[PDB]
Amino acid sequence: GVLNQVLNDNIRNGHVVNQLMEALMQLSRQQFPTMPVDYKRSIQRGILLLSNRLGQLVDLTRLLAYNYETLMACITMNMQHVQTLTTEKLQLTSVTSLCMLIGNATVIPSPQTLFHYYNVNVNFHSNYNERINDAVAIITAANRLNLY
Amino acid sequence: LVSTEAQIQKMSQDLQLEALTIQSETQFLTGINSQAANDCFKTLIAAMLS
Amino acid sequence: VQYEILQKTIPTFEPKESILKKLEDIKPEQVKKQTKLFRIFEPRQLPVYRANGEKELRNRWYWKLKRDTLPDGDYDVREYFLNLYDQVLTEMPDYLLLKDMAVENKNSRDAGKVVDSETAAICDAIFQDEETEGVVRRFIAEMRQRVQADRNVVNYPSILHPIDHAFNEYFLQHQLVEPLNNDIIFNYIPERIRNDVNYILNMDRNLPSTARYIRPNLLQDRLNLHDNFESLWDTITTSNYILARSVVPDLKELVSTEAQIQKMSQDLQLEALTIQSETQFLTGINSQAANDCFKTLIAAMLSQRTMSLDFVTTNYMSLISGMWLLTVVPNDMFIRESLVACQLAIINTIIYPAFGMQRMHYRNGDPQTPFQIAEQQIQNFQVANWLHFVNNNQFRQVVIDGVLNQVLNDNIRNGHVVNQLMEALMQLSRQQFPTMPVDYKRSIQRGILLLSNRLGQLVDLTRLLAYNYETLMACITMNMQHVQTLTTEKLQLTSVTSLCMLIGNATVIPSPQTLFHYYNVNVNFHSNYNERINDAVAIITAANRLNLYQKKMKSIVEDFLKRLQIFDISRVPDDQMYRLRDRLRLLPVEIRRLDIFNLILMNMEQIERASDKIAQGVIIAYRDMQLERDEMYGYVNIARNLDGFQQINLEELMRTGDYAQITNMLLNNQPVALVGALPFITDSSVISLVAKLDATVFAQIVKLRKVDTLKPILYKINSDSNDFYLVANYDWVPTSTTKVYKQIPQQFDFRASMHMLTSNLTFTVYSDLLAFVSADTVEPINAVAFDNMRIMNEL
Amino acid sequence: KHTREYAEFYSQSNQLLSYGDVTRFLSNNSMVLYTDVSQWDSSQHNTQPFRKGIIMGLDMLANMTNDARVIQTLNLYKQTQINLMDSYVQIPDGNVIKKIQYGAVASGEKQTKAANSIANL
Amino acid sequence: LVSSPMSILVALVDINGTFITNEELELEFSNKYVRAIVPDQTFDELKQMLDNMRKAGLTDIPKMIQDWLVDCSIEKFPLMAKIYSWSFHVGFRKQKMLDAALDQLKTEYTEDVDDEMYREY
């Protein structure tokens, strides 16, 4: 009964990273016709820096997807997708850090962490519903009591 | 996480930003620390969840 | 004067760092020699009991593990066997002479010898024992060695467990040494060095027929580190470049710098009053620079390390020296940016202005080099021909003596390209420079004159460079892979000018001792590389075949790179090491390591079942089952097999942590067999068996959801039990509801355990074969190149 | 002298950038961070980490040469750094000389200026 | 005490054209305009510096700085430069070598440092 925003199964198993690697490898073999050769070498070597971490990136994608699904199991309110007024800024250098520093150590939410998250979500949802009920009851009572 | 000195060494050797830079400018690897990696992981998962 | 000492705590910072050696400093790994026979089992005397559990008068010998340190849990057992594989690989020798292990058999009729001393200990223990049968004593008395001097063979008696015999026999029959003689020693020299007429090779020893040597494992790179391992390849190529710099001979009897500089000053007609371009022509001309240029060029070509051109555009003599350098050295040896910069300077300073052509507007990143455009645009035939040759001058990839080598064009090797360069330069000199001031044409002419006053010296220098390159390339054992490196070696063009201006008529060629040293260093590095590849591949394959899924193999690749001794492993990221693991995983395992692992795989179950520390499982039945009669136990609740019972894998139970099935089966008293390496408690108490203690050791599994603490009871009921009379006085065969899945030890049969180990009676092994070769060089005045002519012919 | 980052040493021939180079990139999308570092003589980063970084550089350089004299020069420099890692200072105080442990950086050494520039960068 | 405010004052004056170093004394001039962006914390620090001045018995110098702070103009900045230069003419501070050294080698070394940062450095 809860709306959930789920990922492509290729993200969940991390296989899409292979395609990324494939594309990256193709980009490393390109001539860059008019580009100065030193800049071309630097760009191609960066492309290979990301491409040669194929196994680590597959592991990272699987870990991220698994953590997302496990923590999403604890969400009790509909995961409505809207474009919010203010966003969360994300540095692409932080993305580089995550891509180049991730190892092979699996980290999943602790069962107590999952229960805490689920309990906080349930408490917020129940409080939201109960305060809606209280507000609606008071408003309707005022209207029916003719408290103009 | 991968040792940050090892990864910085690798990425600096491969990128060679120092040689590309003009002699009047400074260029080097930035934001390749473990704190940034943890922040990215948390930010991605939390943003998707919320 | 009294002193006061104030100390402070400075935190200790310990940078992570390995100790890196140069290629010449890498010591060859020591030759493995076996001193004792490898043994996993030994004979041990145990009391035996009758069918009713009564103790017999005589004991019995059984095979028992020498080191019973075998852990609990199936995964830990497989890890133990991986460690055993490592131990056996460490103990596997390179060669074997059994007379070293031979000891006196004091009970032999002929006072003969046996191998090893532990066999003699067993022989004494069996012979002196009163319970030993006289047939065994006769057999021990007949145990002696047999020598065959004509065959150079010796056979020794040995007492070994069948698995011990298998391992030792494999060691004996798969040794690495092989016959050595003078023909082999000379064939060890590279063929091109032997075929060279400039070297005379001599020997003053006749190696005996009983001499041996171990061949280096010179397989070409199975990892292809030249492909996509750019940092590791950069390290390898830098090490090769440093090694090559040390073997390039120093130029001798160069032209005096003072005399040459005076001659150049006279030729240039330098004026004190005027600022001139010719004044810079003399910059940085010295013998040290000439030697540096020679070493840099030859070492970079040998190691295939990319070079970078460093020059000042205001120095035109540097540009003419660069013309010569680009003529002789293939342009792919230079980083593209420096090559195009030097070519553009040459074009726009010498070529286009000579012909009145508008200055080239060359674009950074252009697909064509400046010389490639000039070749199409230049109409003079000589200049265009030289430009075309420089554009198309390339190394030839050729496999010589099984090694990939980069070969210079034959016209470079005999110095004929210098004539084409000189024809182009003379054509440039004849030009008018229509758009330039006459002084500019004068400066260009004076630089060309400086270069062309030494045409014969340049031909000789090109021939010398090519000859030294190919002679030192004969000593390379690993494939010369042509690929641009991450970092380059800087080559100042003033050094090229110094080499061109100061080269004399003296011919210098690599010393035979220098060639042998270079070859030995290369062979040592190649052999160490191959051996460490073999070790890593064997360990990785064994771990995969042992199902060690929790093992992180970063440690194995880290050790492999550490033993390569030239890589700073602490700065190698884990991704690169796991890529190396992936590449290693695709290589076949070396024959000896593979066979040793096959023996271990075949015999590991038996070795594990020989352990007294652990059992292979526990059958929880809920019915009375009579204890088995075994001579070395009495009555024992042992199960030889798990037939007829549902099996719960304890390794899977511990991995998944799901105790639902086992808890349900324990609560419902459903017969089961918990399978996995377990510790057990040995209990000789008959009352404990009557009390059914063994059936009480499973409720903790339900209580705590743990199987680590599980320790089934092994009953050992015989006349040594305190309450054994109950068995004896009631014609009662003990029964139990729980059985311990375990095997009984195998009896030690002395006659069956005797094996005649055969080896060579005696030989001597040699390490450095080139030590037996004394080499010398002909007079350098008469040293000839490939074309049968003297390398340098100028007066 | 040819590295622009080292303001103390950078110069084409002999003269330093006495007016400095900071105003080129001052803009409304730019900010300049400046810090006084005159008090970083006994800081923890001028202790073992700094000297051992220099020592590691020397160890790397030792593998790039075949000349015994260059290797001996590098060894002597490394020994100077090793000795200066565990150093004490003398300070008089009336009639008693205090020997105070000091494994940090100070002027009066040949490499102080350039080494401080390297460490600060 | 008197020289402290300058380190903040330089950050309160907008650029209306400036110099740009080219090579060691060579200046190319820009007409670039840059506004001075100053957070409230910097103003609090300047207030604290003036309070320290007054706590030491200074009345005229902090009053001059406050008067200049009304406009923060470069035309009246010569008075700030004057105060800065004058501060250094109150002589040297030739304290005992013991006290000066102990001030120099006053260290609080800790094992609680960022290992990653130190290894990278």
Strand content of chain D: 5-15%
Overall radius of gyration of chain D: 19 Å
Tell me roughly what share of residues is in helical segments of chain D: 25-40%
| Number of alpha- plus pi-helical segments of chain D | 3
Largest sheet composition of chain A = none
What's the number of extended β-strand segments of chain A?
0
Overall geometry of chain A: elongated
Which chains have the largest interface?
A: A-B, 30 and 30 residues
Binned strand content of chain A: under 5%
* Global Rg of chain A: 24 Å
Strand order of the largest sheet of chain D: 1-2
Query: What is the ordering of alpha helices and beta strands of chain A?
Result: HHHHHH
Distance between the termini of chain A: 39 Å
Count of distinct strands of chain D: 2
Please trace the helix and strand order of chain D, writing H or E for each element.
HHEEH
Number of distinct helices of chain A? 6
Structural category of chain D: alpha+beta
What assembly state would you assign to the polypeptide chains in this entry? part of a larger assembly
PDB class: viral protein
Keywords: Rotavirus, non-enveloped virus
Entry title: Rhesus rotavirus (VP1 structure at 2.65 Angstrom resolution)
Chains A, B, C: Inner capsid protein VP2
Q: What can you see in these coordinates?
A:
The structure is cut from a larger assembly and holds three copies of chain A and two copies of chain D (121 residues). Chain A has helices at 9-12, 16-28, 37-51, 54-72, 92-101, 111-144. Chain A is mainly α and 148 residues long. Chain A is elongated. In chain A, 16% of the residues are buried. The longest helix of chain D has 18 residues, at 68-85. Chain D has a two-stranded antiparallel sheet. Chain D is extended, with a radius of gyration of 19 Å. Classes of the chains: A mainly alpha (148), D alpha+beta (121). Chains in contact: A-B, A-C, B-C, B-D, B-E, C-D, C-E, D-E. Chains A and B meet through helix 3, helix 4 and helix 5 of A and helix 1, helix 2 and helix 3 of B. The PDB classes it as viral protein. Keywords: Rotavirus, non-enveloped virus, viral particle, viral protein.
